[PDB]
Amino acid sequence: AFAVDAAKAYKDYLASGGQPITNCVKMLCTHTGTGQAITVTPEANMDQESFGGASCCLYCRCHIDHPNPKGFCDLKGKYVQIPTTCANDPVGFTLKNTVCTVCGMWKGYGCSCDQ
Amino acid sequence: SSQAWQPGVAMPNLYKMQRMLLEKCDLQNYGDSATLPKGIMMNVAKYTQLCQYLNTLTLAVPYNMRVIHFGAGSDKGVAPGTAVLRQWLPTGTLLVDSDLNDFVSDADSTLIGDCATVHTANKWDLIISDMYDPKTKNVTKENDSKEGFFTYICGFIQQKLALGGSVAIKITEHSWNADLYKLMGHFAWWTAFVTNVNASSSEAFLIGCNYLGKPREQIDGYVMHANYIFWRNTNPIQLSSYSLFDMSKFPLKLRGTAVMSLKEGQINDMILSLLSKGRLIIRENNRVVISSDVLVNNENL
Ligand SMILES: C[n+]1cn([C@@H]2O[C@H](COP(=O)(O)OP(=O)(O)OP(=O)(O)O)[C@@H](O)[C@H]2O)c2nc(N)[nH]c(=O)c21
């Protein structure tokens, strides 16, 4: 019945003015990529930075179990594209945001499936 | 003169041919720091230039390529070099990394422990090591050939590197090993490559290109490290990060290099020619299986 809520702890710590997790691994890339959120190689466009996935995953970085019941991580082994305006906190961004199942862009940061 | 627009500088051949004695390394820019693009870690820049250089060699790049990366952790708890390797290597390439200390990684599998605990059933097409022992900083003595993890690496290459495969092994002035230089003579070509972002350091990657499983050339590793230090002592390299800004051609070309499971008798001069050219890999193509030996102890007296 009891489980640490890692997401909630970090979201609250952020709001209390805590320093975002650092040492997310930022990649060198052309910045001419598709812009999709989670890719097998870096896909940043001119508005995004590309990072190594694992270093941007709250569960990977905190040495705790993943929410997926079989323990699968969405980010490890891939690259997450982060809007340049949020690249100060890649971990928070990926926690607080959602990927569109249709076009693979961040809902609200690339997804335009409502037009 | 055009050097600063390269990812780095490789040991010129005339220095390989010398018979210097070992001196102290004294670099004129020792300790200077490159200006890295915004928010880019040193080791992303260093591994990026290493891979940019490997792109100019005749690496074998088979389907279902197997790469292993030693010394992949960091005082950050993450693995920036692994991230660059996974960016560079064809998608789906199997990548295993390892380190003495725990870290989070994008490799397909990570083993924590001294590298001499690591075993693998299968052979590899590319071995990368950035292992460095921090006690090497305590220079109390002549700069002698070092054993430790280098002894493992030499064995690992002879036992588990596919013919036709390649290596890049980090050394410095004091973290080096004479058998590793000797083994370079067992590859079709070899060099010592200094990245431009770290040109102020005596670090280099000893690169062996296309393994032959026997000596093409007899190399005295003591003399050869003396030659390398002589080169670095007389050729100041200007810190540069220029090449980090062009990633258009960075990915390793998937050449589809053939893989055959031949036996030692079948390696004729023509096979050896294909190996030498990066056109063939020789190893089993079975499934990749790794493990780490764990010492068991019960401390309750
Ligand atoms: C190459 N080098 C090495 N040393 C000394 O030898 C020690 C062991 O040197 P080292 O084997 O760690 O090489 P280096 O320091 O270049 O490696 P890096 O830290 O990975 O960049 C070093 O801590 C220095 O005290 C050096 N000291 C001076 N003054 N100038 C140099 O060029 C120099």
Ligand SMILES: C[S@@+](CC[C@H](N)C(=O)[O-])C[C@H]1O[C@@H](n2cnc3c(N)ncnc32)[C@H](O)[C@@H]1O
């Ligand atoms: C320069 S750092 C690695 C930096 C890392 N490659 C990166 O991408 O940032 C040197 C590494 O070699 C590891 N190392 C040193 N000796 C080792 C040994 N005998 N076995 C395994 N790892 C070792 C250290 O733990 C240390 O993390």
Ligand SMILES: [Zn+2]
């Ligand atoms: Zn994760």
Ligand SMILES: [Zn+2]
């Ligand atoms: Zn969408």
